[PDB]
Amino acid sequence: AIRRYYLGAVELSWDYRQSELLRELHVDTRFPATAPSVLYKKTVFVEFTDQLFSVARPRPPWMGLLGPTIQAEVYDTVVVTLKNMASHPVSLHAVGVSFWKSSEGAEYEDHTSQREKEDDKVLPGKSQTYVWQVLKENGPTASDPPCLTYSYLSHVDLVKDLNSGLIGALLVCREGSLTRERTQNLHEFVLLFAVFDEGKSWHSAAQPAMHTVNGYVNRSLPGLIGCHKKSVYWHVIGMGTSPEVHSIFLEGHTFLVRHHRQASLEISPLTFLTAQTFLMDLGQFLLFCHISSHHHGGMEAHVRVESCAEDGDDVSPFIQIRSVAKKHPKTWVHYIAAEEEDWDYAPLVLAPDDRSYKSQYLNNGPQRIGRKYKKVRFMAYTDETFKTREAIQHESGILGPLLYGEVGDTLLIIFKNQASRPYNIYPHGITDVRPLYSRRLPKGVKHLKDFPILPGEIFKYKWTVTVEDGPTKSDPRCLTRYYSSFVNMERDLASGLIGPLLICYKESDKRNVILFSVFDENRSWYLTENIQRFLPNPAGVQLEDPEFQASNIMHSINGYVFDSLQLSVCLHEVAYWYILSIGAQTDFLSVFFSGYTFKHKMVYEDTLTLFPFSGETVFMSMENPGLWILGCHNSDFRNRGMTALLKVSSCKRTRHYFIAAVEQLWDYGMSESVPRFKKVVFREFADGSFTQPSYRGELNKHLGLLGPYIRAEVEDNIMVTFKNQASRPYSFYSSLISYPDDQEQGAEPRHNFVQPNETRTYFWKVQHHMAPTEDEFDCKAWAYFSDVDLEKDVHSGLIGPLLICRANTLNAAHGRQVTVQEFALFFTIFDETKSWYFTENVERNCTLKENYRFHAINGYVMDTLPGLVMAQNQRIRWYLLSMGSNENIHSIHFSGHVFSVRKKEEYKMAVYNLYPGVFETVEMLPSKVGIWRIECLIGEHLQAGMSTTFLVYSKKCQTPLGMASGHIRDFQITASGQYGQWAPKLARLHYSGSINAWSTKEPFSWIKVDLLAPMIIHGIKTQGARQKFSSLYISQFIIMYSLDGKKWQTYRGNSTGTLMVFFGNVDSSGIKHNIFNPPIIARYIRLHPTHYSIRSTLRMELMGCDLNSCSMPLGMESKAISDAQITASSYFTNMFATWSPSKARLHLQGRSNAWRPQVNNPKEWLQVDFQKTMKVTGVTTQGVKSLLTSMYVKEFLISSSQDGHQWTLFFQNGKVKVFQGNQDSFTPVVNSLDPPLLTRYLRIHPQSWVHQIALRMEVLGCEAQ
Amino acid sequence: IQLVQSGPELKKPGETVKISCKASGYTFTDYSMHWVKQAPGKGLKWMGWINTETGEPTYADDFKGRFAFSLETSASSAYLQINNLKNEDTATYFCARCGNYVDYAIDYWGQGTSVTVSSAKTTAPSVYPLAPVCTTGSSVTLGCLVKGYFPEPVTLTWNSGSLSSGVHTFPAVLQSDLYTLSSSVTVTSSTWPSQSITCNVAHPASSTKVDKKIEPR
Amino acid sequence: ENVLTQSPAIMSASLGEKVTMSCRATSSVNYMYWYQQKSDASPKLWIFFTSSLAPGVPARFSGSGSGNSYSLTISSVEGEAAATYYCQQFTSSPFGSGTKLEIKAKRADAAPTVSIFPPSSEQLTSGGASVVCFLNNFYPKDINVKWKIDGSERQNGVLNSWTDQDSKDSTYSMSSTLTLTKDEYERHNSYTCEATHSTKTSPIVKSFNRNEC
Ligand SMILES: *[C@@H]1O[C@H](CO)[C@@H](O[C@@H]2O[C@H](CO)[C@@H](O[C@@H]3O[C@H](CO[C@H]4O[C@H](CO)[C@@H](O)[C@H](O)[C@@H]4O)[C@@H](O)[C@H](O[C@H]4O[C@H](CO)[C@@H](O)[C@H](O)[C@@H]4O)[C@@H]3O)[C@H](O)[C@H]2NC(C)=O)[C@H](O)[C@H]1NC(C)=O
Ligand SMILES: *[C@@H]1O[C@H](CO)[C@@H](O[C@@H]2O[C@H](CO)[C@@H](O)[C@H](O)[C@H]2NC(C)=O)[C@H](O)[C@H]1NC(C)=O
Ligand SMILES: *[C@@H]1O[C@H](CO)[C@@H](O)[C@H](O)[C@H]1NC(C)=O
Ligand SMILES: [Ca+2]
Ligand SMILES: [Cu+2]
Ligand SMILES: [Zn+2]
């Protein structure tokens, strides 16, 4: 149930091409050879068999730069001894597991002891061990693979660490990995698609940037051997400190990440995906990057399946297919010509302007043809004459016939070329294609893909659909792939050849299609022939200028740019949507639908990401009349062409939210280090009488720059009255707005858009579709913003959370779910130069702008965000959201924490890649207690400041802060208004006498306590006093608190309204406990009396804890500690009773309710076993009063141990702290130990008492080791 | 603990005028502060406030473009420097506090200031002692009519804050470009002219002091 | 924009009568405050935080409420606490105080005490003088003051000036001062001053003549 590991760090030589260099464990005769090949310095992790770090275990070449692979399971432990032997210090942050702050790998605004901080930097020599828990919650879920992809690395400096090569491998399986893993089968190869950059490595001081796969560029990776007809598990771990992505294809295979078909393996910064694939073939294959930007010429490696010796249940394939139907697959009848025509990218043009964006790309002139171009399509014909065309249609131009096929069906694709050049026809995603009739190849044609059909040929292709290229019962009915030519991929693509492919399952029949294409006419074979025909001048010349190219990169929707495609669908009607992104593009498209919500991986989303050369299938229900545009979400597009609209048209209570849009002045980091800037936000208000912006506190203080929670269940209503302040006009769009069917006549473009200082109300019924699925969580996240300029005013500051809770779950008057502390995170980049309010930001007197880039979570930077505080064993529901441009592909990570997400199934994650626009919900429950960090794991974001700390605390650490005994010293107490000789220091609870509390005649009085340190606070015990007969006290009061000097804010916890009114005492002697679930974090705290009785008098005590939650009852009183762990030197044993050492529990009662030594003397003692190693901050002692004989211990020393024979007494100042104890039977006495001690066995020795030695106890402590 | 303001000024339609508000006996820098407007009619009209931790004031809506709020940390005081003083700026301006924290209210006040819209002179008064009608009863009434003075008022009492009871000091109706008030007191036939009642009328804007005693004819 | 309306305006009370005054406001607030101006004095804090009383107020006062309509109740009012009352709120900006509110106690009709005065020494050596006339301790402040000289009268020139409700008695007094020049005095004979109240049908008056006393 434990495993042992050893490891260090070493600097060496590495080249990215030739192997055999990663074996410097025995010196070789290779030093003369200092010739191109190219070499740098790189540093990595190195394994060692033993504990003296000299026996260097060898490694295989397929790993490459990967640190030694590490394994564990549930109910386990992991003991790893790191030792830096290189130059720079290294750490060891981990993901997926469980550690105790003594093992993190990063130091931040943690307010923690430095003993728990040396793990944050391991420096050369030395050692420093770590240990990880892999506890209950970290285990894998059901529909999860047998094992899960996680990792580790040094976190001392992210930008330099990952680019110097500090990285490793760390899978974690469940109880079920001990089995003899079939050594000639499973194999389980580990891959790293890392982007490396020596230009900001550790050691470097215009350097080269590199796309490697485990460290190998240009098809240089050996060692990849998997068996024949048996699958293999891909443990992919994307890196790259730069953002960017890698749409990764395997030459002739698909993938089985999760439960859906995947041609591409779309990775992004720090992804953690586990694919599976079947190796049905023999021979050698390639795995390359299919990005249009061929800087990625390195992301290519070699794969060879081979034969083996002699299918055990290891998630044996699950795409089961057989017979639940009736009819047979039909051989299909298709005739396709690749002939030539001319194309208008906007047959509905207009406006011959100049300043227009639609002039460069479209307006025909004497030197820019803009509008019409000569291309080459895939035309559909009815027979073999190829001289009668199948009815071509609008709303699917420039493209070829729809090509449909079930599993096992047959497609007879007959191809005739009627063009000036040889073109091909070839499908994607399908793994089975050969000529009809024959099996074998032409002449020297190693693979049919890139074989040209001559201008006149007639070739008979036979496509057949297997299963290992289709659905899984999980994904939608018909995944989407493409077909076109292959003899010149990029150019044939830009020439005009394109066509659709569909693979369905049985158990306008299939509707219309959409291709998002960047048609690069500038590489068409009909470039030098498009001039000689269309342009009025020949010797144009001088085209090397970068706006002749941007005069015809026709950013098109199908074959139509600038609102030229106008398809039509009625109301209520249901439409599948097969979407694709093929073209130049280079990157991914964040497509969206104005006022429409669609279903993706059987989940509901607002925006859908589209990788290059990636088919994604969706479907949406049409129940929103009007006229709706499309879009791209990714910046300079749309402007440049990509539009097309839709013209839909026809053929218990309610929750009220008064919202406006004001403009504050924001500063992201007053901490650390300052200019203050001007943005525009939303704020919850009170009335249309817009005077009282409802104050956001406690439950809404993490929000900061975000708009307010607008909560709503399903089947109720959502009224959004929205008045607009500000200067420029903005709006309120949701994609959940559902205007009723109004104004027939013709389809009207939806108005929205309110001029400043004007009001518009929104009122729509929440439908079931906006709600979360039965399979989903309790409350799905939705986006909402302003639709006036969805890019600029989004960098200005208008965004918020629209939450749709499900069923009768958002209860009470509070309008929250209350069973869960729910938070919202917003990972994006802010660039003030696009803001509407940037001109006025010349805030100085009288040139690179790199400090206007704010990598800001919720608008904070470098731990500056406060308001993240969650209960211990509570379930928390996080909401991650990414927006902006395509740089925002954030890898969200909670320091050491693991979370769960639901998309049809419930999987498990530690880092989330937040693709922009998509809004997904996650949940988690935290175990370890303290303050942790929330980061975006992208290297160049942590140092740019994208980070904030979040505290989890103890819900059962209540210790008197010190008002009583005097732990709270006398100078800490202050107040204004004091009447006369009723001093604020007399406010100590249970203190009577002549004068005995603190009063004040004055009206607006208060009283201040300084805790000297940022302390956690868990409640206030409020009393009063008596002057002869009149009971005086506080009947009603409210709370103030601060943190540094004068950032004072009120207490509005547990919603209620404006702020929480506390109820005071009622009598003199009577005590009142005003707890608060939502606790306070402060050090200065003031109380304000609102309704006294005669005079504001007060006798009090504060209930609190330290910032790391160490003052916990371990289990003495609550009987969580077993008696077999509680003994002594003896025990008063006889017949009247027995005072067993197991009877000395604080507050434990009985006729024999204590421990008593059989002989009284200053030698006796009592001992406690913990069976593990724990931390202790104090003891609490308590005597007993049997009969009329009071029995307690007046003084006691304390000694500690790790074993059971050797003891080290508790010292202080110079000698041993004689802890003074009880003076009565009842009242317990705390003695907070200082310093705290890490221990396993604890002893207590008396030195003096009363009558006879007797005691009950409870130990303030906390978990550790 | 008090708010000692300055005595009222006198200006012409549209100038520059600076008041004050010295503190009490506490830490002035921590606490907030308002100025108030109180016309000879309406109940109250708010002027504004200033977070006097380091000086960052605000304003109300009715009043814009012709006011000011400054600071003097030394003597713990706030100012009101009114420019472009239009004519209807004729009202009593005050001083507030609110406390140090939650919901700013009011704590103390002080004396006023108001000399708007002013046209005329200034001058010392004209103390005229009064006389009785001849002999009847033991419930005689006595006065101290003073008429002929501007910037109101004068230290008007009897023997300077001593033997004085049953008085009705009357509002000085403006007539017409100069104020005019009267005094009042009642005594029984066993007080005067034995207890030497001497009125006192000391002007403030001219430091004048005119005490004319009472005696019958 | 945050408007508070005071209800009622000014009421006719009674020395010991349960009387309340609201202060309803368009914009709704959470915490309310009240202030008393004792006849144009430097105002004073009286109720703070909705209902509780400040240090230094006869316990006969109270009042409360929440939201859109607050109130100020008094059990037994006395002429002492008879002055002006404004409500003021703090939930936004600006903090528009209420309109107006005042108290007039009970007590009963009070005949005016009468007295007339003559010119002075250095007074009649200044182009005239003044004939002063007083009405001290009466109720209610309803009133009428006119003059008569032998027969010829004069309505302009009277300097009438009421006071405010008192405390020891809640009675009202009033000043009056008309004058002319010197050749009105030694030349005209009589000199009378009237006081037609709602207590005495014919006014309680005094006598005349330029010579005599
Ligand atoms: C201010 O607002 C906060 C809201 O955050 C309130 O805090 C909640 O207070 C309630 C008490 O009123 C707490 O409720 C109790 O929680 C316990 C948790 O135990 C387990 O519960 C589920 C079981 O499925 C587990 O999933 C979970 O992980 C825990 O392990 C429960 O034990 C309690 O349940 C039952 O208790 C008694 C039995 O004695 C039953 O009679 C009850 O009917 C109930 O079924 C109970 O649910 C709650 O935990 C607090 N919130 C959080 C996040 O912990 C404050 O009360 C509120 N205060 C004020 C002044 O307004
Ligand atoms: C919203 O509209 C009101 C009404 O016009 C604005 O009030 C004006 O504010 C300016 C600013 O100083 C004044 O000069 C005008 O006198 C005001 N007009 C009226 C009729 O009172 C208000 O300022 C507007 N809000 C914003 C944020 O511009
Ligand atoms: C990889 O191939 C590219 C092709 O352009 C070349 O420029 C680069 O130098 C090569 N690198 C290695 C290590 O072979
Ligand atoms: Ca640490
Ligand atoms: Cu990021
Ligand atoms: Zn790549």
One-character DSSP codes across A199-238? GGSSS-----EEE-SSS--SS-----EE-SSS-EEEEEE-
Is residue A948 a contact partner of residue A878, using CB atoms and an 8 Å limit?
A: no
**DSSP secondary-structure letter at A899?**
B
State the nearest Cα–Cα gap between B25 and chain A, in angstroms.
12
Looking from the CA of A1058 toward its CB, the CA atoms found within 13 Å total: 15
The amino acid sitting at A958 is Q
Q: Which ligand is nearest to the CA of A871?
A: 1
CB contact under 8 A, A1086 and B101: yes
**Residue A1091: CB partners within 8 Å, gap ≥ 6?**
A1034, A1035, A1036, A1037, A1064, C49, C51, C52
The string of DSSP codes covering A387-427 is -SB----SSS-SS---B---TT-EEEEEEE--SSS-B--EE
Q: Which atom of ligand 3 is nearest to the CA of A17?
A: 13
Is residue A302 a contact partner of residue A221, using CB atoms and an 8 Å limit?
A: yes
Is residue A81 a contact partner of residue A5, using CB atoms and an 8 Å limit?
A: yes
A757 lines ligand 2 (CB under 6 A): yes
Q: Which ligand is nearest to the CA of A289?
A: 6
User: How far apart, in whole angstroms, are the C-alpha atoms of residue A648 and residue A575?
Assistant: 12
**Residue C203: CB partners within 8 Å, gap ≥ 6?**
C194, C195, C196, C197
User: How far apart, in whole angstroms, are the C-alpha atoms of residue A645 and residue A949?
Assistant: 44
Is residue A954 a contact partner of residue A1105, using CB atoms and an 8 Å limit?
A: yes
Nearest CA to ligand 1 atom 57: A1077
Number of helical H runs and strand E runs in chain B: 0, 15
What is the resolution in angstroms? Answer: 3.9
> B1-118 belongs to which CATH class?
mainly beta
Q: Using a CB-CB distance cutoff of 8 angstroms, which residues of chain B are in contact with residue C119?
A: 128
* Listed residue (A1112, A1109, A1153) closest to A1132, CA to CA: A1153
Residue A219 burial (CB count, 10 A):
15
Which CATH superfamily includes the segment(s) C113-195? Answer: Immunoglobulins (2.60.40.10)
CATH of domain B120-217: 2.60.40.10
User: How far apart, in whole angstroms, are the C-alpha atoms of residue A970 and residue A1226?
Assistant: 27
CB contact under 8 A, B99 and A1004: yes
User: How far apart, in whole angstroms, are the C-alpha atoms of residue B130 and residue B142?
Assistant: 7
The amino acid sitting at A233 is Y
What is the three-class DSSP state of A494?
helix
Residue for token digits 């010119």? C119
CB contact under 8 A, A1004 and C48: yes
How far, rounded to the nearest angstrom, does the alpha carbon of residue A432 sit from its chain's CA centroid?
A: 38
CB burial readout B106-123, b (16+ within 10 A) else e: bbbbbebbbbbebeeeee
SS percent in chain B: helix, strand, coil, step 5: 0, 25, 75
Residue for token digits 């293999």? A232
Chain B contact present for C175, CB below 8 A = yes
Is residue A383 a contact partner of residue A335, using CB atoms and an 8 Å limit?
A: yes
CB contact under 8 A, A1092 and C2: no
The amino acid sitting at A1020 is I
A811 lines ligand 1 (CB under 6 A): no
**DSSP secondary-structure letter at A490?**
H
Task: Specify burial of residue A650 (Cβ count, 10 A radius: 0-12, 13-18, 19+).
Answer: exposed
Bridge partners, residue A682, by sequence: A661
Among A218, A219, A296, which is best to mutate for testing ligand 3, by the most ligand atoms less than 8 A from CB? A218
Task: Specify burial of residue A1206 (Cβ count, 10 A radius: 0-12, 13-18, 19+).
Answer: exposed
**DSSP secondary-structure letter at A493?**
H
What is the three-class DSSP state of A585?
coil
Residue A1252 burial (CB count, 10 A):
16
State the nearest Cα–Cα gap between C82 and chain A, in angstroms.
22
Q: Between β-strands B34-38 and B45-51, what pairing exists: parallel, antiparallel or unpaired?
A: antiparallel
Q: Where are the domains of chain B?
A: 1-118, 120-217
User: How far apart, in whole angstroms, are the C-alpha atoms of residue A113 and residue A682?
Assistant: 40
C10-104 is classed CATH 3.90.1070.10: no
User: How far apart, in whole angstroms, are the C-alpha atoms of residue A1011 and residue A989?
Assistant: 17
Q: Using a CB-CB distance cutoff of 8 angstroms, which residues of chain B are in contact with residue C173?
A: 168, 170, 184
Q: Which atom of ligand 1 is nearest to the CA of A871?
A: 53
Name which of B44, B105, B145 is nearest C132 (Cβ-Cβ): B145
Residue of chain C with shortest Cα separation from A1088:
C49
CB contact under 8 A, C27 and A691: yes
What is the three-class DSSP state of A1129?
coil
* Listed residue (A879, A885, A884, A887) closest to A920, CA to CA: A879
A963-1105 is classed CATH 3.10.129.10: no
Chain B contact present for C92, CB below 8 A = no
Tokens of A995: 């004068």
Tokens of A858: 């919720």
User: How far apart, in whole angstroms, are the C-alpha atoms of residue A1218 and residue A713?
Assistant: 61
**DSSP secondary-structure letter at C94?**
S
Q: What is the 3-state secondary structure (H, E, C) of A293-329?
A: CCCCCCCEEEEEECCCCCCCCCCCCCCCCCCCCCCCC
Backbone angles phi, psi at A975, to 5 degrees: -170, 155
Q: Using a CB-CB distance cutoff of 8 angstroms, which residues of chain A are in contact with residue C50?
A: 1090
The amino acid sitting at C48 is F
User: How far apart, in whole angstroms, are the C-alpha atoms of residue A1144 and residue C153?
Assistant: 107
* Listed residue (A1181, A1185, A1179, A1209) closest to A1193, CA to CA: A1181
Task: Specify burial of residue A730 (Cβ count, 10 A radius: 0-12, 13-18, 19+).
Answer: buried
Same fold, C10-104 and C113-195: yes
* Listed residue (A628, A626, A575, A634) closest to A599, CA to CA: A575
What is the rounded radius of gyration, in angstroms, for the C-alpha atoms of chain A? 36
In residues, how long is chain C?
213
User: How far apart, in whole angstroms, are the C-alpha atoms of residue A1082 and residue A1079?
Assistant: 10
Nearest CA to ligand 1 atom 54: A874
State the nearest Cα–Cα gap between B194 and chain C, in angstroms.
20
Q: Strands of A536-664 (E only): list them.
A: 553-557, 574-581, 589-592, 598-599, 604-605, 607-610, 614-621, 654-662
User: How far apart, in whole angstroms, are the C-alpha atoms of residue A484 and residue B114?
Assistant: 89
Give the DSSP H or E segment for A489: helix A489-495
What is the three-class DSSP state of A1199?
strand
Rounded to a whole number of angstroms, the distance between the first and last alpha carbons of chain B is 50
Is residue A1071 a contact partner of residue A1021, using CB atoms and an 8 Å limit?
A: yes
Tokens of B182: 């009267």
Chains that touch C (3 or more CB pairs under 8 A): A, B
User: How far apart, in whole angstroms, are the C-alpha atoms of residue C183 and residue A109?
Assistant: 95
State the nearest Cα–Cα gap between A809 and chain C, in angstroms.
29
Q: Using a CB-CB distance cutoff of 8 angstroms, which residues of chain B are in contact with residue A1006?
A: 100-101
Tokens of A918: 């998509």
- CA-CA distances (angstroms) from residue A583 to A262, A887, A1046, C87? 19, 20, 58, 71
The amino acid sitting at A933 is R
Residue for token digits 């479209």? A362
Task: Specify burial of residue A995 (Cβ count, 10 A radius: 0-12, 13-18, 19+).
Answer: middle
User: How far apart, in whole angstroms, are the C-alpha atoms of residue A378 and residue A417?
Assistant: 10
Name which of C48, C84, C136 is nearest B105 (Cβ-Cβ): C48
